[PDB]
Design goal:
Blueprint (H helix, E strand, L loop, with lengths): L1 E5 L2 E2 L13 E7 L7 H9 L2 H4 E2 L2 E2 L3 E8 L5 E6 L2 E7 L7 E2 L4 E5 L1 E2 L6 E2 L1 E4 L2 E4 L4 E5 L13 E9 L12 E6 L13 E4 L2 E2 L5 E8 L2 E8 L1 H5 L8 E9 L8 E4 L1 E4 L20 E2 L3 E14 L11 E7 L20 E2 L5 E15 L2 E6 L7 E8 L11 E3 L11 E9 L2
């Protein structure tokens, strides 16, 4: 009884590399090869790997034995019958990599010293790592700072093309992004794809969206000439950019996005944030988290609930440190509204204010305030009030801000009592 110990090495073959855990391998037995005979030994020497395995799947010429992941640098398939085996690295490892090709392993083998049989065989397939893509958010329109509800966000996903084993090809190359639920569908005229800062043969690039529950997945897949020559673009970036509408305030204030890179072109619509053991494992991007806030106005009229015949109107603005309006400061628009009227209960809710974004910059997570450089705070200006009441003469400062630690909705309640 024999064993095959698979050690998954990260690095480039030549023609002591680090062993990697969580690399997934399936062991198959090669049918009808008896290496103790000349019939079988010579059949083994004629074998074309494409006969045993082709198009990402085994043929009927092999029988599956088991599948497992490396741990402590090894996936050991123990208690094996003497046979010719085929070791297949799979796409469902703990981390996404450019996987090893299928390869044959006889068990037992002769000890390299010649001194007897080697029952416990070791093999050392090489794979190449995928770098974590860098996802950022950009405000695509500067008319209003940020991307509060009612405006569009833009995302940029930069993926490095790894150097792969000489004379091998990428199996495929997919970048997928399951947009957060608060976003609408991406504008198809604003999805762009560049490789090495160059546009790609659009015939080779398949841009698709599909719904998975209440979220849109955007998928960019390289195929054809472009995929075939992608091994010549080592260390270049594939950059996907897109815009989408911010349609609602995240309930927890967090508008969070990640993308994923998969070195494969799945035939089924792939959800990169799918779960189980068989799931094709993508390499996740850096996270982007945009922070939102909400202002609630609680209006009273000489201490009373306003009721049916009293209402006030406010606009949201930015103010300088002295409480004065920023020069030429426009009213802030939220979900297409630019003023806010108090209800009979005195409430007015200003929701979906995008405050800023936490994203990777030079490999460090950094928060940027979307309103940086437009004053120092938000403020409310009362533009109308009830019959016989006096308007508030100055903006009402409202402290509403986020930072790198923000992980719930930022709120401020503003109690305002109107006076005769
Ligand atoms: Ca904007």
């Amino acid at each position: 009884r024999t064993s095959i110990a698979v050690h998954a090495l990260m690095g480039l073959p030549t023609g002591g590399l680090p062993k990697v855990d969580g690399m997934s391998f399936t062991l198959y037995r090669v049918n009808e090869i008896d290496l103790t005979t000349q019939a079988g030994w010579d059949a083994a020497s004629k074998i074309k790997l494409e006969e045993l395995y082709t198009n990402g799947h085994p043929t009927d010429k092999v029988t599956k034995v088991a599948t497992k992941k490396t741990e402590g640098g090894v996936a050991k398939f123990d208690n094996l019958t003497p046979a010719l085996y085929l070791v297949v690295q799979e796409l469902n490892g703990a981390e996404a990599v450019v996987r090893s090709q299928p390869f044959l392993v006889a068990a037992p083998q002769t000890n390299p010293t010649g001194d007897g049989w080697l029952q416990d065989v070791h093999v050392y397939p090489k794979h190449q790592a995928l770098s974590e893509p860098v996802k950022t958010a950009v405000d695509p329109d500067a008319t209003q700072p940020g991307f509060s509800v009612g405006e569009n966000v833009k995302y940029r996903v930069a993926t490095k093309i790894p150097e792969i084993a000489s004379n091998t090809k990428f199996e495929g190359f997919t970048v997928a992004d399951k947009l957060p639920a608060e976003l609408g569908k991406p504008d198809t005229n604003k999805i762009t794809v560049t490789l090495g800062g160059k546009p790609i043969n659009s015939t080779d690039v398949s841009v698709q969206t599909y719904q998975v529950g209440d979220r849109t997945v955007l998928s960019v897949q390289l195929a054809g000439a472009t995929l075939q020559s992608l091994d010549q673009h080592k260390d270049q970036e594939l950059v996907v950019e897109f815009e989408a509408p911010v349609t609602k305030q995240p309930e927890n204030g967090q508008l969070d996005n990640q993308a994923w890179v998969l070195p494969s072109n799945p035939t089924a619509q792939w959800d990169p944030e799918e779960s189980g053991d068989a799931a094709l494992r993508g390499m996740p991007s850096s996270r982007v988290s945009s922070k939102f806030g909400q202002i609630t106005i609680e209006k009273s009229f000489d201490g009373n609930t306003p009721g049916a015949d009293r209402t006030a109107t406010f606009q949201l603005h930015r103010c300088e440190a002295d409480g004065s309006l920023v020069k030429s400061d426009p009213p802030i628009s939220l979900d297409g509204k630019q003023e806010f009227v108090t209800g009979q209960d005195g409430k007015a809710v200003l929701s979906g204010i995008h405050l800023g974004t936490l994203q990777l910059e030079s490999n460090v997570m950094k928060y940027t305030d979307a309103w940086a450089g437009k004053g120092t705070e938000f403020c409310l200006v009362e533009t109308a009030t009830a019959s016989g009441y006096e308007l508030l003469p100055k903006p009402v400062i409202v402290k509403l801000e986020a930072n790198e630690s923000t992980n719930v909705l930022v709120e401020q309640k503003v109690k305002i009592d109107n006076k005769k």
